[PDB]
Design a protein around this ligand. Structure first.
Ligand SMILES: [Mg+2]
Ligand SMILES: [Mg+2]
Ligand SMILES: [Mg+2]
Ligand SMILES: [Mg+2]
Ligand SMILES: [Mg+2]
Ligand SMILES: [Mg+2]
Ligand SMILES: [Mg+2]
Ligand SMILES: [Mg+2]
Ligand SMILES: [Mg+2]
Ligand SMILES: [Mg+2]
Ligand SMILES: [Mg+2]
Ligand SMILES: [Mg+2]
Ligand SMILES: [Mg+2]
Ligand SMILES: [Mg+2]
Ligand SMILES: [Mg+2]
Ligand SMILES: [Mg+2]
Ligand SMILES: [Mg+2]
Ligand SMILES: [Mg+2]
Lengths: 271, 88, 116, 65, 70, 100
RNA sequence: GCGGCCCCCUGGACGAAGACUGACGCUCAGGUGCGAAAGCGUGGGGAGCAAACAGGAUUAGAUACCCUGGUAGUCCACGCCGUAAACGAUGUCGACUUGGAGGUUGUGCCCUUGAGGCGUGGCUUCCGGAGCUAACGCGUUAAGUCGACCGCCUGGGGAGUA
């Protein structure tokens, strides 16, 4: 529920908060937590590769179960938890045999709801089953690309994928970007549509609100000097150049896709 | 909308007789069963502006009856509003 | 070539032209002839006569295909709606049946605005 | 004329196609009550019956499908 | 308006049969109506005037039926 | 206890399937204290217009009296069943034995 | 203001025969609520049409009518705006006062013995009687004869403007 903060301070004037009361208020599940050390954008060589990453609150990786290859064995949603790593709230799921796991939360999942996996499962928001069985035209999420790989499409918050048409052994999915892509029909795909759909409507209001998410300041090229950046230079805000990345290659229009080995599966480029 | 079985049962409780429909206690106790039943309807269909005018008529027709009853019999009025729960 | 036996004559009448296409029963065109391209440029191709001339011209250009029977399918309003049918008999064809195909929406797409 | 659907009172349904086929032109258009004579209380029950049978494909929407 | 040319007729009879169907189906009148958008307010005024003159002339002929001109 | 006039069409190449499903629906209808009055099987019919090709179909009439919550489950079994096309659920009352 | 068909939830109206409450009624300054289209904000969607805009014609000019294209918008969700020739230019409630021809929806009796006849209610379109009106016209759904309550008007422009 987007609530606008009252302007008691210049820096709280503009904040908008997305507060969800249904989330769990205590501590996470211990046996499914791990260590997640930060990097800052530094690889083996220790040199930053991606810029504007650094700082931010400490987090812990919650092992979310993406494959969902526990067929049958109905499961009950216990609670919805806030997950710092993702953009969607996760849900603790208890199976009949006594095993607890984590799942991405669909849009219509609450405590006490029942889900299950497998080919035998029923068409219901939260129930995963191979795309060979999901009726054409349906809205799905957590789609896979290769059978058993784990789940790679429509995993953000409020994101979904349409099953446009099934042709033989391959299914054409309308993705979120606007592409139409073929995937093998046997890839599992959790039925529904991911939750936290209001994640867009939040605004941060101040600079520190983004600084404490590991986002360091971004310096424009035109402020730089000609040695540091192709734009550079000037005596009083001169640009006069076709915009380029700090490494020469042109930005603002120039396509860069080149795979030539997975262009079979791209039915229609993004519009 | 107060099916016959649910509307011939309120008359029995509040009516002095079993065939007394129209007494001010019966009428107000019948109206209250519908104002308290449309709350769940209008908590979902908020934009039902045309059905709300029907609700805002059942509300006012009840208040007109209570004012008549209170002036006519104070003892009966103060006993009905607690047997039902209202005047807030 | 291919000496087809039964063909279908598609007439596309309008308020400004008349396009005649003769196709086989599978929907593959063989020849066509319009009114404006038949030396009737201007305010004369609308007339129900320029449809007759093109209908004779379109009756030709299938001479090599040896068509003997036809089905006429009239589409759209306009003057070239009936005069262009009898011109197919004048070429000797045997009309099997006359079907009026005309797109009529069931209050669907919005039409343009009125002229003044 | 006006006698049908008013003599032998009934509530028309969409199963008796043989009856409804007497109230549609060759193209599937419903014939107006002015032409036939059916009273207004029954043309509404005969307009909604034809539209009910069309969805079930018991009658054609048009003469060319 | 589908018409199937039956057995052994002259052409003008079959063609004049098909034209009778187009006139009876009102295809030509429908198309001329749908070429341009008529505003919803101009239709209601056009229908009302086409039910007044129908009525007014109906009374007029009777009101002139009980009259001797010469 | 609300009356209904459920009528559905099946795939023509599933005509042997219908006897199996007509009793399953009636078992579910009766399984919740629900009556049933007319179970006419119209047989195989020719469509007036082609729907997803399929010039023919097999019709079934049910005329069921069931609680309002059972039917909503039954329409779902009509949707996700690939061999059921154009299910229609009317709401009526009363009688039986018409159209054949 | 509402026009395909189906389901779910839901408001109002009318009719026949009864039972019941027993003046519980009418109007209403402030107040509250609903309120076409255009317009605004956030997030979607976009087939057709189309303010703005571009080109072609007409013209003495044509930053318009006509033509070829076309963005906002029209569509959906939630909020805001609160105005129209929002018009029957006619406030709401009640009583009384000659007729005719229809529409639509109920109900009663009798030769439904056969597309019948005779009544009684609700809504509604057209013509006209007395009466009213400056005239046009209204004319049982009054602009007729009256009763209660409210709103508004007091020469034209300036101005529904500062
Ligand atoms: Mg930035
Ligand atoms: Mg510098
Ligand atoms: Mg350089
Ligand atoms: Mg400078
Ligand atoms: Mg410069
Ligand atoms: Mg045009
Ligand atoms: Mg006021
Ligand atoms: Mg608007
Ligand atoms: Mg908008
Ligand atoms: Mg927008
Ligand atoms: Mg234009
Ligand atoms: Mg005003
Ligand atoms: Mg109006
Ligand atoms: Mg006014
Ligand atoms: Mg009032
Ligand atoms: Mg008059
Ligand atoms: Mg002002
Ligand atoms: Mg103004």
């Amino acid at each position: 529920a987007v609530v606008k903060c009252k302007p008691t301070s210049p820096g709280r004037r503009h904040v908008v908060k997305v507060v969800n009361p249904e989330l769990h208020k205590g501590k996470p599940f211990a046996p499914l937590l791990e260590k997640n050390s930060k990097s800052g954008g530094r690889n083996n060589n220790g040199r930053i590769t991606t810029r504007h990453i650094g700082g931010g609150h400490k987090q812990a990786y919650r092992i979310v179960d993406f494959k969902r290859n526990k067929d049958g064995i109905p499961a009950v949603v216990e609670r919805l938890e806030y997950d710092p790593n993702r953009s969607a709230n996760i849900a603790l799921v208890l199976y009949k045999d006594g095993e607890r796991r984590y799942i991405l939360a669909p849009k219509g999942l609450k405590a006490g709801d029942q889900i299950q996996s497998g080919v035998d499962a029923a068409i219901k928001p939260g129930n995963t089953l191979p795309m060979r069985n999901i009726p054409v035209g349906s809205t799905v999420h957590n789609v896979e690309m290769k059978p058993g790989k784990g789940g790679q499409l429509a995993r953000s918050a409020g994101t979904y994928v349409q099953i446009v048409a099934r042709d033989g052994a391959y299914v054409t999915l309308r993705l979120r970007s606007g592409e139409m892509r073929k995937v093998e029909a046997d890839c599992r795909a959790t039925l529904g549509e991911v939750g936290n759909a209001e994640h867009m409507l939040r605004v941060l209001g101040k600079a520190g609100a983004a600084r404490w998410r590991g986002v360091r300041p971004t310096v424009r090229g035109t402020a730089m000097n000609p040695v540091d950046h192709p734009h550079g230079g000037g005596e009083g805000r001169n640009f006069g150049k076709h915009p380029v990345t700090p490494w020469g290659v042109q930005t603002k229009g120039k396509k860069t896709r080149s795979n030539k080995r997975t262009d079979k599966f791209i039915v229609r480029r993004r519009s | 909308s107060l099916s016959t079985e649910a509307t011939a049962k309120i008359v029995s409780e509040f009516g002095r007789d079993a065939n007394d429909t129209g007494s001010t206690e019966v009428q107000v106790a019948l109206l209250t069963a519908q104002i308290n039943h449309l709350q769940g309807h209008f908590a979902e269909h908020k934009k039902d502006h045309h059905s709300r005018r029907g609700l805002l008529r059942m509300v006012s027709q009840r208040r007109k009856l209570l004012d008549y009853l209170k002036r006519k019999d104070v003892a009966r009025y103060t006993q009905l509003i607690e047997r039902l729960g209202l005047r807030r | 070539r291919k000496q087809v036996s039964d063909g279908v004559a598609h007439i596309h009448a309008s308020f400004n032209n008349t396009i005649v296409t003769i196709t086989d029963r599978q929907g593959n065109a063989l020849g066509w002839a319009t009114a404006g391209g038949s030396g009737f440029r201007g305010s004369r191709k609308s007339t129900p006569f320029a449809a007759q001339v093109a209908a004779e011209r379109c009756a030709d250009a299938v001479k090599e295909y040896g068509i003997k029977n036809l089905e006429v399918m009239v589409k759209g309003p306009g003057p070239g709606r009936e005069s262009t049918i009898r011109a197919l008999n004048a070429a000797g064809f045997r009309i099997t049946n006359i079907t009026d195909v005309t797109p009529i929406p069931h209050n669907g797409c919005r039409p343009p605005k009125k002229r003044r | 004329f006006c006698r049908f659907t008013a003599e032998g009172v009934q509530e028309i349904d969409y199963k008796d196609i043989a009856t409804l086929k007497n109230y549609i032109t060759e193209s599937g258009k419903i014939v107006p009550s002015r032409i036939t004579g059916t009273r207004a209380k029954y043309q509404r029950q005969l307009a909604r019956a034809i539209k009910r049978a069309r969805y079930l494909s018991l009658l054609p929407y048009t003469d060319r499908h | 308006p589908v018409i199937k040319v039956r057995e052994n007729e002259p052409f003008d009879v079959a063609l004049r049969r098909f034209k009778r169907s187009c006139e009876k189906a009102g295809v030509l009148a429908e198309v001329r109506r749908r070429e341009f958008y008529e505003k919803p307010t101009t239709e209601r005024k056009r229908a009302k005037a086409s039910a007044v003159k129908r009525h007014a002339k109906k009374l007029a002929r009777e009101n002139a039926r009980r009259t001797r001109l010469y | 206890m609300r009356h209904y006039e459920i009528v559905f069409m099946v795939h023509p190449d599933q005509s042997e399937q219908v006897p199996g499903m007509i009793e399953r629906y009636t078992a579910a209808i009766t399984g919740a204290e629900g009556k049933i009055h007319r179970l006419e099987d119209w047989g195989r019919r020719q469509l007036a217009y082609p729907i997803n090709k399929l010039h023919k179909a097999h019709y079934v009439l049910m005329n069921v009296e069931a609680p309002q919550e059972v039917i909503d489950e039954l329409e779902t079994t009509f949707r996700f069943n690939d061999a059921v096309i154009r299910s229609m659920v009317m709401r009526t009352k009363h009688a039986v034995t018409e159209a054949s």
